[PDB]
Write an enzyme that holds these catalytic residues in place. Structure first.
Site, PDB file in Angstrom:
ATOM      1  N   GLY A   1      14.493 -15.932  -0.208  1.00 60.01           N
ATOM      2  CA  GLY A   1      13.864 -14.539  -1.260  1.00 60.01           C
ATOM      3  C   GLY A   1      14.225 -13.648  -1.399  1.00 60.01           C
ATOM      4  O   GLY A   1      14.271 -13.010  -2.746  1.00 60.01           O
TER       5      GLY A   1
ATOM      6  N   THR B   1      17.364 -25.187   5.549  1.00 57.22           N
ATOM      7  CA  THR B   1      16.498 -24.329   6.742  1.00 57.22           C
ATOM      8  C   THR B   1      15.456 -24.220   5.722  1.00 57.22           C
ATOM      9  O   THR B   1      14.141 -24.049   6.315  1.00 57.22           O
ATOM     10  CB  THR B   1      16.737 -23.610   7.212  1.00 57.22           C
ATOM     11  OG1 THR B   1      17.119 -22.360   6.397  1.00 57.22           O
ATOM     12  CG2 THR B   1      18.305 -23.177   7.874  1.00 57.22           C
TER      13      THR B   1
ATOM     14  N   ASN C   1      29.521 -15.623  11.930  1.00 62.05           N
ATOM     15  CA  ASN C   1      28.987 -14.959  11.368  1.00 62.05           C
ATOM     16  C   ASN C   1      30.392 -14.288  11.867  1.00 62.05           C
ATOM     17  O   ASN C   1      30.567 -12.802  10.709  1.00 62.05           O
ATOM     18  CB  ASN C   1      28.062 -14.149  11.070  1.00 62.05           C
ATOM     19  CG  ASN C   1      25.995 -14.182  10.487  1.00 62.05           C
ATOM     20  OD1 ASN C   1      26.884 -15.180   9.531  1.00 62.05           O
ATOM     21  ND2 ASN C   1      25.596 -13.951  11.131  1.00 62.05           N
TER      22      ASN C   1
ATOM     23  N   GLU D   1      42.889  -5.514  -8.404  1.00 64.91           N
ATOM     24  CA  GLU D   1      44.608  -6.517  -8.504  1.00 64.91           C
ATOM     25  C   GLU D   1      43.407  -8.443  -8.272  1.00 64.91           C
ATOM     26  O   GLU D   1      44.152  -9.440  -9.277  1.00 64.91           O
ATOM     27  CB  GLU D   1      45.271  -6.643  -7.177  1.00 64.91           C
ATOM     28  CG  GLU D   1      46.185  -5.863  -7.322  1.00 64.91           C
ATOM     29  CD  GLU D   1      47.785  -5.896  -8.095  1.00 64.91           C
ATOM     30  OE1 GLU D   1      48.053  -7.685  -7.837  1.00 64.91           O
ATOM     31  OE2 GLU D   1      48.968  -5.460  -8.522  1.00 64.91           O
TER      32      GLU D   1
HETATM   33  N1  LIG Z   1      26.128 -18.153   7.218  1.00 64.00           N
HETATM   34  C1  LIG Z   1      25.172 -17.695   7.903  1.00 64.00           C
HETATM   35  N2  LIG Z   1      23.682 -17.794   7.417  1.00 64.00           N
HETATM   36  C2  LIG Z   1      22.785 -16.884   7.616  1.00 64.00           C
HETATM   37  C3  LIG Z   1      22.228 -16.119   8.204  1.00 64.00           C
HETATM   38  N3  LIG Z   1      21.521 -15.943   8.064  1.00 64.00           N
HETATM   39  C4  LIG Z   1      20.702 -16.467   7.114  1.00 64.00           C
HETATM   40  N4  LIG Z   1      21.489 -17.379   7.140  1.00 64.00           N
HETATM   41  C5  LIG Z   1      20.983 -17.990   6.219  1.00 64.00           C
HETATM   42  O1  LIG Z   1      19.652 -17.957   5.636  1.00 64.00           O
HETATM   43  C6  LIG Z   1      18.299 -19.199   5.255  1.00 64.00           C
HETATM   44  C7  LIG Z   1      17.594 -18.532   5.225  1.00 64.00           C
HETATM   45  O2  LIG Z   1      16.996 -17.276   4.331  1.00 64.00           O
HETATM   46  P1  LIG Z   1      17.129 -15.712   3.862  1.00 64.00           P
HETATM   47  O3  LIG Z   1      18.464 -16.078   3.152  1.00 64.00           O
HETATM   48  O4  LIG Z   1      17.734 -15.763   5.325  1.00 64.00           O
HETATM   49  O5  LIG Z   1      15.706 -16.069   4.092  1.00 64.00           O
HETATM   50  P2  LIG Z   1      15.295 -13.728   3.607  1.00 64.00           P
HETATM   51  O6  LIG Z   1      16.733 -13.542   3.464  1.00 64.00           O
HETATM   52  O7  LIG Z   1      14.991 -13.747   4.649  1.00 64.00           O
HETATM   53  O8  LIG Z   1      14.568 -13.604   2.155  1.00 64.00           O
HETATM   54  P3  LIG Z   1      13.218 -14.132   2.771  1.00 64.00           P
HETATM   55  O9  LIG Z   1      13.126 -15.226   3.741  1.00 64.00           O
HETATM   56  O10 LIG Z   1      12.178 -14.225   1.515  1.00 64.00           O
HETATM   57  O11 LIG Z   1      12.420 -12.394   3.165  1.00 64.00           O
HETATM   58  C8  LIG Z   1      18.883 -20.017   5.549  1.00 64.00           C
HETATM   59  O12 LIG Z   1      19.434 -21.556   5.481  1.00 64.00           O
HETATM   60  C9  LIG Z   1      20.521 -19.705   6.543  1.00 64.00           C
HETATM   61  O13 LIG Z   1      21.309 -21.019   5.383  1.00 64.00           O
HETATM   62  C10 LIG Z   1      23.110 -16.097   8.890  1.00 64.00           C
HETATM   63  O14 LIG Z   1      23.726 -14.908   9.846  1.00 64.00           O
HETATM   64  N5  LIG Z   1      24.553 -16.753   8.908  1.00 64.00           N
HETATM   65  N1  LIG Z   2      63.785  -6.589  -5.167  1.00 68.17           N
HETATM   66  C1  LIG Z   2      62.884  -6.372  -4.497  1.00 68.17           C
HETATM   67  N2  LIG Z   2      61.557  -6.951  -5.300  1.00 68.17           N
HETATM   68  C2  LIG Z   2      60.200  -6.914  -5.138  1.00 68.17           C
HETATM   69  C3  LIG Z   2      60.572  -5.422  -4.427  1.00 68.17           C
HETATM   70  N3  LIG Z   2      58.797  -5.077  -4.524  1.00 68.17           N
HETATM   71  C4  LIG Z   2      58.800  -6.162  -4.994  1.00 68.17           C
HETATM   72  N4  LIG Z   2      59.023  -7.069  -5.903  1.00 68.17           N
HETATM   73  C5  LIG Z   2      58.650  -8.342  -6.710  1.00 68.17           C
HETATM   74  O1  LIG Z   2      58.021  -7.896  -8.072  1.00 68.17           O
HETATM   75  C6  LIG Z   2      57.351  -8.932  -8.242  1.00 68.17           C
HETATM   76  C7  LIG Z   2      55.996  -7.622  -8.418  1.00 68.17           C
HETATM   77  O2  LIG Z   2      56.228  -6.217  -8.110  1.00 68.17           O
HETATM   78  P1  LIG Z   2      54.926  -5.284  -8.454  1.00 68.17           P
HETATM   79  O3  LIG Z   2      54.535  -5.464  -7.194  1.00 68.17           O
HETATM   80  O4  LIG Z   2      53.900  -6.526  -8.706  1.00 68.17           O
HETATM   81  O5  LIG Z   2      55.781  -4.463  -9.345  1.00 68.17           O
HETATM   82  P2  LIG Z   2      54.200  -3.000  -9.834  1.00 68.17           P
HETATM   83  O6  LIG Z   2      54.239  -3.116 -11.113  1.00 68.17           O
HETATM   84  O7  LIG Z   2      55.128  -2.191  -9.350  1.00 68.17           O
HETATM   85  O8  LIG Z   2      53.076  -3.468  -9.026  1.00 68.17           O
HETATM   86  C8  LIG Z   2      56.938  -9.359  -7.217  1.00 68.17           C
HETATM   87  O9  LIG Z   2      57.117 -11.064  -7.327  1.00 68.17           O
HETATM   88  C9  LIG Z   2      58.248  -8.855  -6.213  1.00 68.17           C
HETATM   89  O10 LIG Z   2      59.415 -10.491  -5.956  1.00 68.17           O
HETATM   90  C10 LIG Z   2      60.810  -4.630  -4.185  1.00 68.17           C
HETATM   91  O11 LIG Z   2      61.212  -3.713  -3.176  1.00 68.17           O
HETATM   92  N5  LIG Z   2      62.166  -4.958  -4.266  1.00 68.17           N
END
Ligand SMILES: Nc1nc2c(ncn2[C@@H]2O[C@H](COP(=O)(O)OP(=O)(O)OP(=O)(O)O)[C@@H](O)[C@H]2O)c(=O)[nH]1
Ligand SMILES: Nc1nc2c(ncn2[C@@H]2O[C@H](COP(=O)(O)OP(=O)(O)O)[C@@H](O)[C@H]2O)c(=O)[nH]1
Ligand SMILES: [Mg+2]
EC number: 3.6.5.-
Lengths: 430, 40, 97, 427, 50
Positions: free
Chosen positions: A135, A170, A219, A245
């Site tokens: 929730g 869960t 985690n 980007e």
């Molecule tokens: N991957 C992962 N999932 C988690 C973790 N902790 C909780 N969950 C997920 O959260 C779900 C439980 O509901 P929550 O979103 O935690 O409940 P809440 O955020 O406390 O919301 P309220 O219970 O209403 O206060 C579980 O089904 C888990 O899948 C975590 O540490 N790692």
């Molecule tokens: N010859 C050469 N090519 C580069 C270099 N840096 C990036 N490139 C080429 O440039 C492309 C992307 O350029 P980009 O980083 O986006 O240029 P920007 O527009 O200045 O960000 C990539 O496909 C690379 O192959 C460099 O130092 N030398």
């Protein structure tokens, strides 16, 4: 300067936030108390002399997780009123977090965000962490993204949301809170990165050889995905890929903004036995279907766009060759209208290892974020379970009586019907 | 080249102020507004 | 005098720290990490660089030359059977210059 | 006394420009501190073409560094030969184009163009004469592509009778680090064809092929690729910086290479490239440099020279050598395979000899080729552009900054018009 | 600079090699003729070294 502000919402948000900020401290050498023994500016703001505080807020209606951080190993790291608590939780209800009890706390949340936005020189985006199952992550997450869009216009937002699994759930109201939260992040969240719970359980079972993985083990490596995505901002790289980007180069359409997650080298501490994997092998591992962070097979869909985040000692030649080898592979299918959809972000710092963590030291790593039409079956699986419960109108009286109207449930459902529809026709060949 | 360079950078327009040739000034610094000169 | 002297000292210390870290990154080779060539030798003119990488490259080249000399000695020694040239009576020696 | 003003744009141009100033400063004997410590009198005779005289005997390059994000200028200022550049020329943006051609052209380029125009006016008006302007940028990127093309538009409106030599790296077929290269490149060429007086076409895949098949590098890096560009860029200005038996400025190479105003896209190559193993066996001789000059593997463009006939060509030999075998070798290639040369232009090849070779080489030559085979690299950019334009892919990002979908069509039409006049001369 | 021949005399510096006085070496730039030379060298912008 490049600054980013992350927001963590709900029980999943805080416990991920505990794991992610644990890794951000040791990447920059930050001690748990908050003292070092210019790259830190993207995540930590120096205050006074030697004190660094995170650029994040921890808001949660349930106070039982935020006080664990307040008394844990990082009490001195966070600003004392940067973490936001509440008296009562949303109790797995989207209506409570959106209208009744989420309204009193969200006004205090924007006050913390505005003071964080004024302190940073140049803000580059928002990394929102929440779970749509619960929730608090759904309701308060939807309201926070609602106010942040109006207050901060045209600024990028990165969504790392945890969707419910098709198999392991869960709660019984998991599809209800997931469907309603999807309508909020369709037109507000600029980038949605798909995360699933037991998909990471599969990764820990077969690659980290952990027989009994917990939420903490889940985690830790999902934190490595966020760090590898933001590694272009923190450290100098061969081809820097900023936040701005990422949006204009991964979403082709304004409403198609869902991307999958994959982290290529996953080896246990014992499982390494002093070996290194080349660039081509880990690039093949990133596109392996079982190595993804959600349970969707990309063979059914087709890759709309891709993004490769490389870390460590990777020369620009072999990553270009690894792109070519993936393209010639017939199992990975690309959409017809996009000829070249790959990316190269090559940072030259290897990912660090936390003490006691399952991941071993690797020289090179790949973070793979990709847009694909295989997400259409992810939304359809939640739709299939939602239509079973909504036809009998089960678990609805909690939603109706808590301010929320009945007729908007069909409004949120028909938006997923549109979201299922345009995934089919855009990926359709022309 | 060094000969001509040194004579051009040591040349002055008025000949009568050359007698000082055989502390930097405020306009050289263009800063240190309260730190121009020193007490005692 | 202490107030504006401290202000200017902070300004100059920040500027000098920036200049010092740029100079350190220049002299340690971290700066222009995009632009150094592999194998530490000039691509256009085949000449060794003036760095420690070039010196180690020259050392590796001399080691490779010594290993090739050893293999040449082995092949010559077990290609010639007797210590005598077959056509003309002459000593057999390993040819070097 | 006649000079070239250099402008570098974005991530590509700053790294290419830093390697270009790495070579010509080594040629003219300027140390990374700035003082002249060269050991030749001819180096100091023509310094003013690329360097300004400063106090204390120092020389600063006449370069303008411009981009939209400050990541490059942290890298450029921190490298070797990096502290010689003037910080007043360090004009920087804050947002970053982010591989968007529209962002650099209209939205955030516009506030920075007035800043980059003032430093060009500061640098061009400070001398006595201009030979022209030299720019190195990309077409598939966004920082040097969109912002660079408007800079060419304003500098041609202000200085219309001056040369424009552009070293533009184009998107590559084999390698692609971006998704919107055909979108940015087609918009860039449509702005570049009428404004740039001449253009050098470069690409990463031909530079990678030269480092792999010819130079025998196991793991080439962007520094290896930028060094091949830097040698060619200094090779164009060989006769300006140094005396010779034949002298040729940028206009001398302009007048002999473009029969018509629109055919100003050339393809370049550096001749004496050999691995370290075979340097002692190879005899560096004028027939040997000529043999590698016309070879297809030595070209730094994606165009295959055997497919399309050379329209006009230029060879810029460096070092003490006789013009007779220089002339005879290019006479020999005109007669051995006449089908590879155009019929209605006699004396397709221009030759110039400079008597000061580069450092560490006894002889060198830089080749400029106006070929009708360069249509094929523009078609693949056009083919990928029509692949995504017909489905309006990634177009909502472009229309956000204020460019309509209409001028994508004249961008598409002028790409097809530029190649259409290429095949009419191939026949 | 060419390398000196072996057994070089290690020649003495120029000032008191040719016999300059302390007053002359102190006031080399203070002389009116040297001042006029510097003025003409300033006037010849780039042709001073010609
Ligand atoms: N991957 C992962 N999932 C988690 C973790 N902790 C909780 N969950 C997920 O959260 C779900 C439980 O509901 P929550 O979103 O935690 O409940 P809440 O955020 O406390 O919301 P309220 O219970 O209403 O206060 C579980 O089904 C888990 O899948 C975590 O540490 N790692
Ligand atoms: N010859 C050469 N090519 C580069 C270099 N840096 C990036 N490139 C080429 O440039 C492309 C992307 O350029 P980009 O980083 O986006 O240029 P920007 O527009 O200045 O960000 C990539 O496909 C690379 O192959 C460099 O130092 N030398
Ligand atoms: Mg809770």
């Amino acid at each position: 300067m490049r600054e980013v502000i992350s927001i963590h919402i709900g029980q999943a948000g805080i416990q991920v936030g505990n794991a992610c900020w644990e890794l951000y401290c040791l990447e920059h050498g930050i001690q748990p108390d908050g003292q070092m023994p210019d790259a830190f500016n993207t995540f930590f703001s120096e205050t006074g002399a030697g004190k660094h505080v995170p650029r994040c807020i921890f808001l949660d209606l349930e106070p039982t997780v935020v006080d664990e951080v307040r008394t844990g190993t990082y009490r001195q790291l966070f600003h004392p009123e940067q973490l936001i608590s509440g008296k009562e939780d949303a109790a797995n209800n989207f209506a409570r977090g959106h209208y009744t009890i989420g309204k009193e706390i969200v006004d205090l949340a924007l006050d913390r965000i505005r003071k964080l936005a004024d302190n940073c020189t140049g803000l580059q985006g928002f990394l929102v962490f929440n779970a749509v199952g619960g929730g608090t992550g759904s309701g308060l997450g939807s309201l926070l993204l609602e106010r942040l869009s109006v207050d901060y216009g045209k600024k990028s937002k990165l969504g790392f949301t945890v969707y419910p699994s098709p198999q392991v759930s869960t709660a019984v109201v998991e599809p209800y809170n997931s469907v309603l939260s999807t309508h909020s992040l369709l037109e507000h969240t600029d980038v949605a990165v798909m995360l699933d719970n037991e998909a990471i359980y599969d990764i820990c079972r077969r690659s980290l050889d952990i027989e009994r993985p917990t939420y903490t083990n889940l985690n830790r490596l999902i934190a490595q995905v966020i760090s590898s995505l933001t590694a272009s901002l923190r450290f100098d790289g061969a081809l820097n890929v900023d936040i701005t980007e990422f949006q204009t180069n991964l979403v082709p359409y304004p409403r198609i903004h869902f991307m999958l997650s994959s982290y290529a080298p996953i080896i246990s501490a014992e499982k390494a036995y002093h070996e290194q994997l080349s660039v081509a092998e880990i690039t093949n591992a990133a596109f392996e279907p079982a190595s993804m962070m959600v349970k969707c097979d990309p063979r059914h869909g087709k890759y709309m766009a891709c993004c490769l985040m490389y870390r460590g000692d990777v020369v620009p030649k072999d990553v270009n060759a690894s792109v070519a080898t993936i393209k010639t592979k017939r199992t990975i299918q690309f959409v017809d209208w996009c000829p070249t959809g790959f990316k190269c972000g090559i940072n030259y710092q290897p990912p660090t290892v936390v003490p006691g963590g399952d991941l071993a030291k690797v020289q090179r790593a790949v973070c793979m974020i990709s847009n694909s039409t295989a997400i259409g079956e992810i939304f359809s699986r939640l739709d299939h379970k939602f239509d079973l419960m909504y036809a009998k109108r089960a678990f609805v009286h909690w939603y109706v009586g808590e301010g929320m109207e009945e007729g908007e449930f069909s409004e949120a459902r028909e938006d997923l019907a549109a979201l299922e529809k345009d995934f089919e026709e855009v990926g359709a060949e022309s | 080249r060094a000969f001509v360079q040194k004579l051009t950078e040591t040349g002055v327009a008025n000949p009568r102020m050359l007698h000082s040739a055989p502390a930097t000034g405020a306009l050289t610094r263009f800063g240190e507004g309260g730190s121009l000169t020193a007490p005692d | 005098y202490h107030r504006e002297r401290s202000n200017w000292e902070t300004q100059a210390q920040a500027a000098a720290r920036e200049a010092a870290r740029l100079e350190a990154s220049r002299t340690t080779g971290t700066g222009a990490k995009r632009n150094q060539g592999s194998e530490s030798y000039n691509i256009i003119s085949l000449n060794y660089n003036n760095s420690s990488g070039g010196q180690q490259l020259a050392a590796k080249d001399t080691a490779v030359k010594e290993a090739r000399q050893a293999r040449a000695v082995n092949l010559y020694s077990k290609s010639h059977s007797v210590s005598h040239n077959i056509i003309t009576g002459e000593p057999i020696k390993f040819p070097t210059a | 006394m006649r000079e070239i003003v250099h402008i570098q744009g974005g991530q590509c141009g700053n790294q290419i420009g830093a390697k270009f100033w790495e070579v010509v400063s080594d040629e003219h004997g300027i140390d990374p501190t700035g003082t002249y410590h060269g050991d030749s009198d001819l180096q100091l005779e023509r310094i003013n073409v690329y360097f300004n005289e400063a106090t204390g005997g120092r020389y600063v390059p006449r370069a303008i560094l411009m981009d939209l994000e400050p990541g490059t200028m942290d890298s450029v200022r921190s490298g070797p030969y990096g502290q010689i550049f003037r910080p007043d020329n360090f004009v920087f943006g804050q947002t970053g184009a982010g591989n968007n051609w529209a962002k650099g052209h209209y939205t955030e380029g516009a506030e920075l163009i007035d800043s980059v125009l003032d430093v060009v006016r500061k640098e061009a008006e400070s001398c006595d004469c201009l030979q022209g302007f030299q720019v190195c940028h990309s077409l598939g990127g966004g920082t040097g592509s969109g912002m660079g093309t408007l800079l060419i538009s304003k500098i041609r409106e202000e200085y219309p009778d001056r040369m424009m030599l552009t070293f533009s790296v184009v998107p590559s077929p084999k390698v692609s680090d971006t998704v919107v290269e055909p979108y940015n490149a087609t918009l860039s060429v449509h702005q570049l064809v009428e404004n740039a007086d001449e253009c050098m076409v470069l690409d990463n895949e031909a530079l990678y092929d030269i480092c792999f098949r010819t130079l025998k590098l196991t793991t080439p890096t962007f520094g290896d690729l930028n060094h091949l560009i830097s040698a060619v860029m200094s090779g164009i200005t060989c006769c300006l910086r140094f005396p010779g038996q034949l002298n040729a400025d940028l206009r001398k190479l302009a007048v002999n290479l473009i029969p018509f105003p629109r055919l100003h896209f050339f393809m370049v190559g550096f001749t004496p490239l050999t691995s370290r193993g075979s340097q002692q066996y190879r005899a560096l001789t004028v027939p040997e440099l000529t043999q590698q000059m016309w070879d297809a593997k030595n070209m730094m463009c994606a165009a295959d020279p055997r497919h399309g006939r050379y329209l006009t060509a230029s060879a810029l030999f460096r070092g003490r050598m006789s013009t007779k075998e220089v002339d005879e070798q290019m006479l020999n290639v005109q007669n051995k395979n006449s089908s590879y040369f155009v019929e209605w232009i006699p004396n397709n090849v221009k030759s110039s000899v400079c008597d000061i070779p580069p450092k560490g080489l006894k002889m060198s030559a830089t080749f400029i080729g106006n070929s009708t085979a360069i249509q094929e690299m523009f078609k693949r950019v056009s083919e990928q552009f029509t692949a995504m334009f017909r489905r309006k892919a990634f177009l909502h990002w472009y229309t956000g900054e204020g460019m309509d979908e209409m001028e994508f069509t004249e961008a598409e039409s002028n790409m097809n018009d530029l190649v259409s006049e290429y095949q009419q001369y191939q026949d | 600079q060419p390398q000196q021949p072996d057994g070089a005399p290690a020649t003495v510096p120029l000032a008191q090699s040719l016999g300059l006085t302390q007053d002359e070496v102190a006031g080399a730039l203070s002389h009116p003729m040297v001042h006029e030379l510097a003025r003409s060298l300033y006037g010849k912008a780039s042709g001073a070294t010609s």
